[PDB]
Amino acid sequence: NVKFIQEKKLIGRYFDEISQDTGKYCFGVEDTLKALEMGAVEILIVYENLDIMRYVLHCQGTEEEKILYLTPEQEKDKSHFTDKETGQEHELIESMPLLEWFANNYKKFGATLEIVTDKSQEGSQFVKGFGGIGGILRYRVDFQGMEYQGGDDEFFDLDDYLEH
């Protein structure tokens, strides 16, 4: 019956600690993913019915790939992946379930992928905080990026290093 306490204890800690502004938690795929790449997330709390997945969009001129988080509505528009109101530039090639992805790479990130639900009070908080994805950090971190963002590695060209 860990599921009952899994949501009440793990999840509650997420908001309770944040109640101290300890800066050891995050909400949302983008945020939760960022800290999970940072291995700064002690325990990852995600939901089964997550309406967010990892997709790979192309560019109008090509030679450039974009990765964004979409919902059934947006994902449904795979061919265009654009908007008839703005005419963005998106072209879906592949689509990987973020939940499944978080449950298959929880070791690489060192995070603990725990799948919760809005059934409990705490489970109701995550939905309010964001709605599907939240992360618990191992310890107080300053994150990496610009001056306000934190560090100074926001512009890491190391991404191209992988390709080489």
Swiss-Prot record:
Transmembrane regions listed in the UniProt entry: none
Covalent link (Glycyl lysine isopeptide (Lys-Gly) (interchain with G-Cter in SUMO2)) residue numbers: 128
Domain of life: Eukaryota
Family per similarity comment: Belongs to the eukaryotic release factor 1 family.
Quaternary structure annotation from Swiss-Prot or TrEMBL: Component of the eRF1-eRF3-GTP ternary complex, composed of ETF1/ERF1 and eRF3 (GSPT1/ERF3A or GSPT2/ERF3B) and GTP. Component of the transient SURF (SMG1-UPF1-eRF1-eRF3) complex. Interacts with JMJD4. The ETF1-GSPT1 complex interacts with JMJD4.
Subcellular location: Cytoplasm
Protein name: Eukaryotic peptide chain release factor subunit 1
Gene assigned in the entry: ETF1
Modification Phosphothreonine, positions: 71
Segment of the intact protein contained: 277 to 437 of 437
Function description: Component of the eRF1-eRF3-GTP ternary complex, a ternary complex that mediates translation termination in response to the termination codons. The eRF1-eRF3-GTP complex binds to a stop codon in the ribosomal A-site. ETF1/ERF1 is responsible for stop codon recognition and inducing hydrolysis of peptidyl-tRNA. Following GTP hydrolysis, eRF3 (GSPT1/ERF3A or GSPT2/ERF3B) dissociates, permitting ETF1/eRF1 to accommodate fully in the A-site and mediate hydrolysis of peptidyl-tRNA.
PTM field: Ubiquitinated at Lys-3 via 'Lys-6'-linked polyubiquitin chains by RNF14 and RNF25 in response to ribosome collisions (ribosome stalling), leading to its degradation by the proteasome and rescue of stalled ribosomes.
Cross-link (Glycyl lysine isopeptide (Lys-Gly) (interchain with G-Cter in ubiquitin)): 3
Natural source organism: Homo sapiens
